[PDB]
Design a protein around this ligand. Structure first.
Ligand SMILES: O=c1ccn([C@@H]2O[C@H](COP(=O)(O)OP(=O)(O)O)[C@@H](O)[C@H]2O)c(=O)[nH]1
Ligand SMILES: *[C@@H]1O[C@H](CO)[C@@H](O)[C@H](O[C@@H]2O[C@H](CO)[C@@H](O)[C@H](O)[C@H]2O)[C@H]1O
Ligand SMILES: *[C@@H]1O[C@H](CO)[C@@H](O)[C@H](O)[C@H]1O
Ligand SMILES: NC(=O)CC[C@H](N)C(=O)O
Ligand SMILES: O=C(O)c1ccccc1O
Length: 442
Protein backbone atom coordinates (compact mmCIF):
# COMPACT_ATOMS: atom_id res chain seq x y z
CA UNK A 1 0.00 0.00 0.00
CA UNK A 2 2.44 2.67 -1.22
CA UNK A 3 1.75 6.00 -2.96
CA UNK A 4 4.44 7.90 -4.89
CA UNK A 5 4.17 11.65 -5.55
CA UNK A 6 6.32 12.22 -8.66
CA UNK A 7 7.53 15.77 -9.28
CA UNK A 8 9.26 16.45 -12.64
CA UNK A 9 10.93 19.66 -13.62
CA UNK A 10 8.27 21.46 -15.79
CA UNK A 11 9.62 20.79 -19.25
CA UNK A 12 8.93 18.13 -21.86
CA UNK A 13 12.23 16.32 -21.50
CA UNK A 14 11.61 15.83 -17.79
CA UNK A 15 7.85 15.24 -17.63
CA UNK A 16 8.09 12.45 -20.22
CA UNK A 17 10.57 10.14 -18.39
CA UNK A 18 8.68 10.83 -15.16
CA UNK A 19 5.37 9.85 -16.72
CA UNK A 20 6.86 6.73 -18.33
CA UNK A 21 8.45 5.72 -15.04
CA UNK A 22 5.10 6.11 -13.24
CA UNK A 23 3.53 3.75 -15.81
CA UNK A 24 6.15 1.19 -14.82
CA UNK A 25 5.32 1.72 -11.16
CA UNK A 26 1.63 1.27 -11.91
CA UNK A 27 2.45 -1.98 -13.70
CA UNK A 28 4.30 -3.14 -10.55
CA UNK A 29 1.29 -2.32 -8.36
CA UNK A 30 2.42 1.05 -6.96
CA UNK A 31 0.00 3.99 -7.03
CA UNK A 32 1.44 7.25 -8.35
CA UNK A 33 0.31 10.85 -8.48
CA UNK A 34 2.11 13.14 -10.92
CA UNK A 35 2.59 16.72 -9.64
CA UNK A 36 2.39 19.13 -12.58
CA UNK A 37 2.59 22.92 -12.48
CA UNK A 38 -0.70 24.64 -13.27
CA UNK A 39 0.76 26.26 -16.40
CA UNK A 40 1.97 22.91 -17.74
CA UNK A 41 -1.26 21.12 -16.78
CA UNK A 42 -3.39 23.61 -18.72
CA UNK A 43 -0.98 23.35 -21.69
CA UNK A 44 -1.38 19.58 -22.21
CA UNK A 45 -3.99 18.10 -24.53
CA UNK A 46 -5.07 14.91 -22.74
CA UNK A 47 -5.01 11.91 -25.09
CA UNK A 48 -4.01 9.42 -22.41
CA UNK A 49 -2.46 5.99 -23.03
CA UNK A 50 -3.09 4.55 -19.58
CA UNK A 51 -4.46 5.47 -16.16
CA UNK A 52 -3.22 8.78 -14.74
CA UNK A 53 -3.68 10.68 -11.50
CA UNK A 54 -2.50 14.30 -11.63
CA UNK A 55 -2.26 16.95 -8.90
CA UNK A 56 -1.33 20.50 -9.74
CA UNK A 57 1.31 22.58 -7.98
CA UNK A 58 2.61 26.06 -8.70
CA UNK A 59 5.98 27.41 -9.75
CA UNK A 60 4.72 30.95 -9.23
CA UNK A 61 3.90 31.48 -12.93
CA UNK A 62 0.51 29.85 -13.46
CA UNK A 63 -0.56 32.44 -16.05
CA UNK A 64 2.48 32.66 -18.32
CA UNK A 65 4.86 29.93 -17.26
CA UNK A 66 8.61 30.46 -17.53
CA UNK A 67 8.45 33.20 -20.17
CA UNK A 68 6.91 35.64 -17.64
CA UNK A 69 9.81 35.28 -15.18
CA UNK A 70 12.26 38.19 -15.08
CA UNK A 71 15.22 35.81 -15.11
CA UNK A 72 16.19 32.16 -14.83
CA UNK A 73 17.36 32.69 -11.27
CA UNK A 74 14.02 34.23 -10.27
CA UNK A 75 12.14 31.30 -11.82
CA UNK A 76 14.02 28.64 -9.86
CA UNK A 77 13.79 30.74 -6.70
CA UNK A 78 10.04 31.28 -6.92
CA UNK A 79 9.56 27.62 -7.88
CA UNK A 80 11.35 26.50 -4.72
CA UNK A 81 9.12 28.80 -2.66
CA UNK A 82 5.75 28.16 -4.35
CA UNK A 83 6.56 24.55 -5.22
CA UNK A 84 7.54 23.66 -1.67
CA UNK A 85 4.24 25.00 -0.31
CA UNK A 86 2.00 23.39 -2.92
CA UNK A 87 3.76 20.02 -2.75
CA UNK A 88 3.16 20.03 1.00
CA UNK A 89 -0.51 20.79 0.25
CA UNK A 90 -0.87 17.55 -1.69
CA UNK A 91 0.77 15.46 1.02
CA UNK A 92 -1.29 17.03 3.81
CA UNK A 93 -4.59 16.67 1.96
CA UNK A 94 -3.87 13.01 1.22
CA UNK A 95 -2.92 12.15 4.82
CA UNK A 96 -6.62 11.49 5.56
CA UNK A 97 -7.35 9.40 2.50
CA UNK A 98 -7.36 5.80 1.32
CA UNK A 99 -3.68 5.98 0.22
CA UNK A 100 -1.63 8.71 1.92
CA UNK A 101 1.52 9.62 0.04
CA UNK A 102 4.46 7.53 1.27
CA UNK A 103 7.27 8.64 -1.06
CA UNK A 104 8.40 11.59 -3.17
CA UNK A 105 10.22 10.94 -6.42
CA UNK A 106 11.42 14.41 -7.32
CA UNK A 107 13.51 15.76 -10.20
CA UNK A 108 17.18 16.06 -9.22
CA UNK A 109 16.97 19.67 -10.48
CA UNK A 110 14.70 20.36 -7.44
CA UNK A 111 16.62 19.24 -4.34
CA UNK A 112 14.33 21.30 -2.08
CA UNK A 113 11.75 18.57 -2.58
CA UNK A 114 13.80 16.33 -0.28
CA UNK A 115 13.25 18.89 2.50
CA UNK A 116 9.50 18.56 2.05
CA UNK A 117 9.66 14.77 2.04
CA UNK A 118 11.62 14.83 5.29
CA UNK A 119 9.16 17.27 6.89
CA UNK A 120 6.40 14.68 6.45
CA UNK A 121 8.42 11.54 7.23
CA UNK A 122 8.37 10.34 3.62
CA UNK A 123 10.83 8.34 1.57
CA UNK A 124 12.67 10.71 -0.80
CA UNK A 125 14.43 9.83 -4.06
CA UNK A 126 15.85 12.24 -6.65
CA UNK A 127 15.32 11.32 -10.30
CA UNK A 128 18.11 12.23 -12.74
CA UNK A 129 16.84 12.55 -16.30
CA UNK A 130 20.39 12.77 -17.76
CA UNK A 131 22.90 9.91 -18.27
CA UNK A 132 25.32 8.65 -15.63
CA UNK A 133 28.37 10.11 -17.36
CA UNK A 134 26.88 13.61 -17.32
CA UNK A 135 25.76 13.34 -13.69
CA UNK A 136 29.12 11.91 -12.54
CA UNK A 137 30.96 14.89 -14.05
CA UNK A 138 28.60 17.20 -12.16
CA UNK A 139 29.14 15.21 -8.97
CA UNK A 140 32.90 15.58 -9.34
CA UNK A 141 32.50 19.34 -9.67
CA UNK A 142 30.28 19.53 -6.60
CA UNK A 143 32.55 17.67 -4.18
CA UNK A 144 35.37 19.98 -5.27
CA UNK A 145 33.47 23.20 -5.40
CA UNK A 146 32.19 24.19 -8.82
CA UNK A 147 35.40 23.30 -10.67
CA UNK A 148 36.36 20.24 -12.66
CA UNK A 149 39.94 19.02 -13.14
CA UNK A 150 40.82 17.78 -16.60
CA UNK A 151 41.69 15.08 -17.33
CA UNK A 152 39.05 13.24 -15.31
CA UNK A 153 41.19 10.47 -13.88
CA UNK A 154 38.78 7.53 -14.25
CA UNK A 155 37.44 8.92 -17.57
CA UNK A 156 40.64 10.20 -19.21
CA UNK A 157 39.33 10.28 -22.82
CA UNK A 158 37.05 13.30 -22.17
CA UNK A 159 38.22 16.74 -23.38
CA UNK A 160 36.94 20.25 -22.70
CA UNK A 161 34.74 20.26 -25.78
CA UNK A 162 33.10 17.04 -24.60
CA UNK A 163 31.95 18.62 -21.32
CA UNK A 164 28.57 20.20 -20.58
CA UNK A 165 28.32 23.64 -22.14
CA UNK A 166 28.66 25.42 -18.78
CA UNK A 167 32.33 24.38 -18.68
CA UNK A 168 33.31 25.27 -22.27
CA UNK A 169 31.19 28.45 -22.69
CA UNK A 170 32.61 30.26 -19.70
CA UNK A 171 30.16 32.24 -17.60
CA UNK A 172 27.13 30.91 -19.51
CA UNK A 173 23.80 30.29 -17.73
CA UNK A 174 25.15 30.75 -14.17
CA UNK A 175 21.81 29.95 -12.53
CA UNK A 176 21.34 26.75 -14.56
CA UNK A 177 24.96 25.79 -13.80
CA UNK A 178 24.33 26.22 -10.08
CA UNK A 179 21.20 24.11 -10.52
CA UNK A 180 22.94 21.11 -12.08
CA UNK A 181 25.69 21.34 -9.46
CA UNK A 182 23.15 21.62 -6.64
CA UNK A 183 21.53 18.31 -7.58
CA UNK A 184 24.03 16.81 -5.09
CA UNK A 185 23.56 19.17 -2.13
CA UNK A 186 21.58 16.63 -0.11
CA UNK A 187 21.59 13.41 -2.16
CA UNK A 188 23.50 12.07 0.84
CA UNK A 189 20.22 12.13 2.79
CA UNK A 190 18.22 10.57 -0.08
CA UNK A 191 17.13 6.94 0.08
CA UNK A 192 17.97 6.12 -3.53
CA UNK A 193 19.19 7.87 -6.64
CA UNK A 194 17.22 7.08 -9.79
CA UNK A 195 18.59 7.63 -13.29
CA UNK A 196 16.95 7.38 -16.73
CA UNK A 197 19.56 5.08 -18.23
CA UNK A 198 20.24 1.37 -18.32
CA UNK A 199 23.37 -0.28 -17.00
CA UNK A 200 24.61 -1.83 -20.24
CA UNK A 201 24.62 1.60 -21.92
CA UNK A 202 27.26 3.13 -19.57
CA UNK A 203 28.67 0.26 -17.51
CA UNK A 204 31.87 2.06 -16.54
CA UNK A 205 30.20 5.35 -15.59
CA UNK A 206 27.35 3.62 -13.75
CA UNK A 207 29.92 1.61 -11.84
CA UNK A 208 31.96 4.73 -11.00
CA UNK A 209 29.04 6.88 -9.91
CA UNK A 210 27.65 3.98 -7.85
CA UNK A 211 30.75 3.99 -5.62
CA UNK A 212 29.66 7.40 -4.32
CA UNK A 213 25.89 6.79 -4.14
CA UNK A 214 23.23 4.10 -4.28
CA UNK A 215 22.32 4.59 -7.95
CA UNK A 216 19.48 2.65 -9.60
CA UNK A 217 19.23 2.69 -13.39
CA UNK A 218 15.54 2.41 -14.22
CA UNK A 219 15.51 3.31 -17.91
CA UNK A 220 15.15 3.61 -20.77
CA UNK A 221 11.74 5.31 -20.38
CA UNK A 222 10.77 4.44 -23.98
CA UNK A 223 7.19 3.14 -24.22
CA UNK A 224 6.80 -0.55 -23.48
CA UNK A 225 5.29 -1.37 -26.89
CA UNK A 226 8.59 -0.64 -28.62
CA UNK A 227 10.63 -2.78 -26.28
CA UNK A 228 9.67 -5.39 -23.66
CA UNK A 229 5.92 -5.10 -24.49
CA UNK A 230 5.05 -6.08 -20.89
CA UNK A 231 2.80 -3.01 -20.39
CA UNK A 232 0.02 -3.29 -22.94
CA UNK A 233 -1.34 0.22 -22.42
CA UNK A 234 2.09 1.88 -22.81
CA UNK A 235 1.87 2.68 -26.52
CA UNK A 236 3.32 6.17 -26.69
CA UNK A 237 4.23 9.35 -24.93
CA UNK A 238 0.90 10.73 -23.68
CA UNK A 239 1.76 14.03 -21.90
CA UNK A 240 2.67 16.39 -24.73
CA UNK A 241 3.18 20.14 -24.21
CA UNK A 242 3.17 20.64 -28.01
CA UNK A 243 0.18 20.03 -30.23
CA UNK A 244 0.70 16.97 -32.38
CA UNK A 245 -0.64 18.24 -35.74
CA UNK A 246 -2.79 15.04 -35.82
CA UNK A 247 0.06 12.69 -36.39
CA UNK A 248 -1.02 10.57 -39.37
CA UNK A 249 0.08 13.01 -42.12
CA UNK A 250 3.79 12.74 -41.34
CA UNK A 251 3.79 8.96 -40.84
CA UNK A 252 1.68 8.44 -43.98
CA UNK A 253 4.20 10.62 -45.83
CA UNK A 254 7.15 8.57 -44.51
CA UNK A 255 5.62 5.29 -45.69
CA UNK A 256 5.82 6.41 -49.34
CA UNK A 257 9.56 7.01 -49.14
CA UNK A 258 12.26 4.44 -49.92
CA UNK A 259 14.02 2.84 -46.99
CA UNK A 260 16.75 4.88 -45.36
CA UNK A 261 16.18 7.87 -47.63
CA UNK A 262 14.89 10.49 -45.19
CA UNK A 263 17.13 12.64 -42.99
CA UNK A 264 15.13 13.38 -39.83
CA UNK A 265 16.03 16.72 -38.19
CA UNK A 266 14.83 17.87 -34.78
CA UNK A 267 16.13 19.92 -31.89
CA UNK A 268 14.04 18.97 -28.93
CA UNK A 269 11.60 21.16 -27.02
CA UNK A 270 13.58 24.28 -26.10
CA UNK A 271 16.80 24.68 -28.14
CA UNK A 272 16.85 27.97 -30.10
CA UNK A 273 19.01 28.38 -33.20
CA UNK A 274 20.15 31.70 -34.74
CA UNK A 275 19.14 33.00 -38.17
CA UNK A 276 22.69 32.36 -39.32
CA UNK A 277 22.56 28.78 -38.03
CA UNK A 278 19.11 28.20 -39.54
CA UNK A 279 20.41 29.22 -42.97
CA UNK A 280 23.42 26.90 -42.82
CA UNK A 281 20.99 24.17 -41.79
CA UNK A 282 18.31 24.95 -44.39
CA UNK A 283 20.99 24.87 -47.10
CA UNK A 284 22.59 21.62 -45.93
CA UNK A 285 19.21 19.98 -45.38
CA UNK A 286 18.07 20.71 -48.92
CA UNK A 287 20.62 18.44 -50.57
CA UNK A 288 18.61 15.51 -49.18
CA UNK A 289 15.15 14.13 -48.67
CA UNK A 290 14.35 15.34 -45.17
CA UNK A 291 11.77 15.58 -42.39
CA UNK A 292 12.57 18.70 -40.32
CA UNK A 293 10.83 19.92 -37.16
CA UNK A 294 10.78 23.70 -36.74
CA UNK A 295 8.86 24.73 -33.65
CA UNK A 296 6.27 27.43 -34.22
CA UNK A 297 8.32 30.00 -32.30
CA UNK A 298 11.36 29.25 -34.51
CA UNK A 299 9.73 29.69 -37.95
CA UNK A 300 10.79 33.36 -38.00
CA UNK A 301 14.45 32.38 -38.29
CA UNK A 302 14.30 30.37 -41.50
CA UNK A 303 15.19 32.33 -44.66
CA UNK A 304 12.29 34.25 -46.13
CA UNK A 305 10.65 32.16 -48.83
CA UNK A 306 12.09 28.86 -47.57
CA UNK A 307 8.90 26.99 -46.62
CA UNK A 308 7.67 27.43 -50.20
CA UNK A 309 10.86 26.47 -52.06
CA UNK A 310 10.87 23.18 -50.16
CA UNK A 311 10.49 20.24 -52.56
CA UNK A 312 7.26 18.67 -51.36
CA UNK A 313 7.91 15.40 -53.18
CA UNK A 314 11.01 14.53 -51.15
CA UNK A 315 10.73 16.68 -48.01
CA UNK A 316 8.39 18.01 -45.34
CA UNK A 317 8.53 20.55 -42.48
CA UNK A 318 6.59 20.18 -39.23
CA UNK A 319 5.89 22.20 -36.10
CA UNK A 320 6.22 19.04 -33.98
CA UNK A 321 6.64 15.37 -34.76
CA UNK A 322 5.44 12.02 -33.34
CA UNK A 323 9.13 11.41 -32.74
CA UNK A 324 8.81 7.82 -31.55
CA UNK A 325 6.86 6.77 -34.65
CA UNK A 326 9.20 8.80 -36.84
CA UNK A 327 12.30 7.09 -35.42
CA UNK A 328 10.77 3.61 -35.73
CA UNK A 329 9.90 4.22 -39.41
CA UNK A 330 12.30 2.64 -41.87
CA UNK A 331 12.23 5.57 -44.30
CA UNK A 332 14.57 7.30 -41.84
CA UNK A 333 18.18 7.28 -42.98
CA UNK A 334 19.66 9.20 -40.08
CA UNK A 335 18.79 11.59 -37.27
CA UNK A 336 20.29 15.08 -37.22
CA UNK A 337 19.85 15.74 -33.50
CA UNK A 338 20.68 18.27 -30.81
CA UNK A 339 21.61 15.25 -28.63
CA UNK A 340 19.06 15.82 -25.89
CA UNK A 341 19.15 12.68 -23.80
CA UNK A 342 15.63 11.40 -24.56
CA UNK A 343 16.18 11.85 -28.30
CA UNK A 344 19.61 10.17 -28.02
CA UNK A 345 18.27 7.15 -26.17
CA UNK A 346 15.33 6.94 -28.56
CA UNK A 347 17.68 7.02 -31.54
CA UNK A 348 19.92 4.38 -29.93
CA UNK A 349 17.15 1.92 -29.09
CA UNK A 350 15.55 2.33 -32.51
CA UNK A 351 18.81 1.81 -34.41
CA UNK A 352 18.97 5.20 -36.16
CA UNK A 353 22.54 6.52 -36.66
CA UNK A 354 22.96 10.16 -35.72
CA UNK A 355 24.54 13.39 -36.89
CA UNK A 356 25.16 14.99 -33.48
CA UNK A 357 24.71 18.80 -33.40
CA UNK A 358 24.79 19.57 -29.67
CA UNK A 359 23.71 23.04 -28.62
CA UNK A 360 24.24 23.40 -24.85
CA UNK A 361 23.86 21.86 -21.36
CA UNK A 362 24.53 18.08 -21.39
CA UNK A 363 24.32 17.75 -25.19
CA UNK A 364 28.14 17.89 -25.85
CA UNK A 365 28.64 14.88 -23.56
CA UNK A 366 25.95 12.90 -25.37
CA UNK A 367 27.51 13.94 -28.68
CA UNK A 368 30.86 12.58 -27.51
CA UNK A 369 29.40 9.22 -26.46
CA UNK A 370 27.39 9.01 -29.70
CA UNK A 371 30.49 9.44 -31.84
CA UNK A 372 33.33 7.86 -29.87
CA UNK A 373 31.84 5.42 -27.32
CA UNK A 374 28.65 3.97 -28.81
CA UNK A 375 30.06 4.72 -32.30
CA UNK A 376 26.48 5.33 -33.44
CA UNK A 377 27.00 8.68 -35.19
CA UNK A 378 29.34 11.55 -35.97
CA UNK A 379 29.60 15.02 -34.44
CA UNK A 380 29.38 17.99 -36.81
CA UNK A 381 32.49 20.13 -37.01
CA UNK A 382 31.74 23.65 -35.79
CA UNK A 383 33.83 26.66 -36.75
CA UNK A 384 35.48 28.10 -33.66
CA UNK A 385 35.09 31.85 -34.29
CA UNK A 386 31.31 31.33 -34.25
CA UNK A 387 30.22 28.12 -32.55
CA UNK A 388 28.19 27.69 -35.75
CA UNK A 389 28.06 24.69 -38.07
CA UNK A 390 28.65 25.68 -41.69
CA UNK A 391 26.48 24.07 -44.35
CA UNK A 392 29.44 22.25 -45.90
CA UNK A 393 30.28 20.52 -42.61
CA UNK A 394 26.64 19.65 -41.94
CA UNK A 395 26.44 18.14 -45.42
CA UNK A 396 29.67 16.20 -44.94
CA UNK A 397 28.43 14.73 -41.65
CA UNK A 398 25.09 13.68 -43.12
CA UNK A 399 26.73 11.87 -46.03
CA UNK A 400 29.21 10.17 -43.71
CA UNK A 401 26.28 8.66 -41.85
CA UNK A 402 24.14 8.12 -44.97
CA UNK A 403 26.66 6.50 -47.36
CA UNK A 404 30.37 6.36 -46.50
CA UNK A 405 32.35 3.32 -45.45
CA UNK A 406 31.90 3.90 -41.72
CA UNK A 407 28.18 4.40 -42.47
CA UNK A 408 27.69 0.65 -42.83
CA UNK A 409 29.66 -0.03 -39.64
CA UNK A 410 27.66 2.54 -37.64
CA UNK A 411 24.35 0.94 -38.66
CA UNK A 412 25.22 -2.47 -37.21
CA UNK A 413 26.76 -0.91 -34.09
CA UNK A 414 23.58 0.96 -33.21
CA UNK A 415 21.31 -2.04 -33.83
CA UNK A 416 22.68 -3.80 -30.73
CA UNK A 417 21.00 -1.41 -28.29
CA UNK A 418 17.42 -2.53 -28.89
CA UNK A 419 17.91 -6.05 -27.51
CA UNK A 420 19.99 -4.75 -24.60
CA UNK A 421 17.23 -2.34 -23.58
CA UNK A 422 14.61 -5.07 -24.06
CA UNK A 423 16.68 -7.46 -21.94
CA UNK A 424 17.06 -4.80 -19.25
CA UNK A 425 13.28 -4.19 -19.04
CA UNK A 426 12.33 -7.90 -19.07
CA UNK A 427 12.29 -10.11 -15.98
CA UNK A 428 15.63 -10.36 -14.24
CA UNK A 429 17.16 -7.51 -16.25
CA UNK A 430 19.14 -4.79 -14.53
CA UNK A 431 16.44 -2.09 -14.84
CA UNK A 432 13.58 -4.47 -14.00
CA UNK A 433 15.50 -5.57 -10.90
CA UNK A 434 16.30 -1.98 -9.90
CA UNK A 435 12.63 -1.03 -10.24
CA UNK A 436 11.80 -3.94 -7.91
CA UNK A 437 14.41 -2.71 -5.40
CA UNK A 438 12.74 0.72 -5.38
CA UNK A 439 9.21 -0.66 -5.22
CA UNK A 440 10.10 -2.97 -2.33
CA UNK A 441 11.44 -0.07 -0.27
CA UNK A 442 8.45 2.19 -1.00
O1 LIG B 1 9.34 17.20 -32.89
C1 LIG B 1 9.57 16.64 -31.86
C2 LIG B 1 10.83 16.87 -31.10
C3 LIG B 1 11.00 16.13 -29.82
N1 LIG B 1 9.98 15.22 -29.36
C4 LIG B 1 10.12 14.51 -28.12
O2 LIG B 1 10.44 15.51 -27.30
C5 LIG B 1 11.43 14.89 -26.23
C6 LIG B 1 12.59 15.85 -26.21
O3 LIG B 1 13.42 15.49 -25.12
P1 LIG B 1 15.06 15.62 -25.24
O4 LIG B 1 15.63 15.06 -23.96
O5 LIG B 1 15.58 14.97 -26.51
O6 LIG B 1 15.35 17.20 -25.49
P2 LIG B 1 14.99 18.58 -24.68
O7 LIG B 1 13.66 18.94 -25.31
O8 LIG B 1 14.86 18.18 -23.24
O9 LIG B 1 16.08 19.56 -25.02
C7 LIG B 1 11.75 13.64 -26.72
O10 LIG B 1 11.06 12.56 -25.97
C8 LIG B 1 11.31 13.52 -28.17
O11 LIG B 1 10.85 12.28 -28.60
C9 LIG B 1 8.74 14.98 -30.09
O12 LIG B 1 7.94 14.23 -29.66
N2 LIG B 1 8.59 15.71 -31.34
C1 LIG C 1 15.27 27.24 -19.00
O1 LIG C 1 15.61 28.49 -19.66
C2 LIG C 1 15.34 28.47 -21.05
C3 LIG C 1 15.86 29.74 -21.73
O2 LIG C 1 17.29 29.81 -21.61
C4 LIG C 1 13.80 28.28 -21.25
O3 LIG C 1 13.49 28.28 -22.65
C5 LIG C 1 13.30 27.01 -20.56
O4 LIG C 1 11.86 26.98 -20.59
C6 LIG C 1 11.31 25.82 -21.13
O5 LIG C 1 10.82 26.18 -22.44
C7 LIG C 1 10.02 25.18 -23.06
C8 LIG C 1 9.58 25.74 -24.42
O6 LIG C 1 10.75 25.97 -25.24
C9 LIG C 1 8.84 24.77 -22.19
O7 LIG C 1 8.27 23.60 -22.79
C10 LIG C 1 9.30 24.42 -20.79
O8 LIG C 1 8.15 24.22 -19.98
C11 LIG C 1 10.18 25.50 -20.16
O9 LIG C 1 10.77 25.04 -18.93
C12 LIG C 1 13.74 27.00 -19.09
O10 LIG C 1 13.35 25.76 -18.46
C1 LIG D 1 20.18 28.71 -24.10
O1 LIG D 1 21.12 28.91 -25.13
C2 LIG D 1 21.13 27.86 -26.07
C3 LIG D 1 22.31 28.20 -27.06
O2 LIG D 1 23.50 28.15 -26.42
C4 LIG D 1 19.79 27.77 -26.81
O3 LIG D 1 19.87 26.54 -27.54
C5 LIG D 1 18.61 27.71 -25.80
O4 LIG D 1 17.43 27.91 -26.54
C6 LIG D 1 18.82 28.71 -24.67
O5 LIG D 1 17.87 28.35 -23.65
N1 LIG E 1 4.19 -2.43 -3.88
C1 LIG E 1 4.00 -1.65 -2.82
O1 LIG E 1 2.97 -0.96 -2.66
C2 LIG E 1 5.11 -1.62 -1.78
C3 LIG E 1 4.71 -0.83 -0.55
C4 LIG E 1 5.86 -0.27 0.29
N2 LIG E 1 6.86 0.40 -0.53
C5 LIG E 1 6.52 -1.37 1.12
O2 LIG E 1 7.15 -1.09 2.14
O1 LIG F 1 14.92 20.65 -19.73
C1 LIG F 1 16.17 20.24 -19.87
O2 LIG F 1 16.43 19.23 -20.52
C2 LIG F 1 17.35 21.03 -19.20
C3 LIG F 1 18.54 20.43 -19.18
C4 LIG F 1 19.67 21.08 -18.58
C5 LIG F 1 19.53 22.33 -18.03
C6 LIG F 1 18.33 22.95 -18.05
C7 LIG F 1 17.21 22.32 -18.64
O3 LIG F 1 15.98 23.02 -18.62
Amino acid sequence: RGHVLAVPYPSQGHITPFRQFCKRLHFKGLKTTLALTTFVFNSINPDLSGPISIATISDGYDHGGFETADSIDDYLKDFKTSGSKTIADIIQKHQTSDNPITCIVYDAFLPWALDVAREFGLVATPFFTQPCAVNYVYYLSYINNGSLQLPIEELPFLELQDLPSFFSVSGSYPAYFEMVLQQFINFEKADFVLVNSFQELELHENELWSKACPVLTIGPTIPSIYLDQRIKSDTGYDLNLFESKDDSFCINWLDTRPQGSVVYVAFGSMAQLTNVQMEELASAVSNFSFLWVVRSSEEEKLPSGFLETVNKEKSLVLKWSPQLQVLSNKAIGCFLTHCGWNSTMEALTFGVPMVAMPQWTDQPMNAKYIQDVWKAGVRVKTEKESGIAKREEIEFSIKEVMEGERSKEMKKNVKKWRDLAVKSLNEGGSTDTNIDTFVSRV
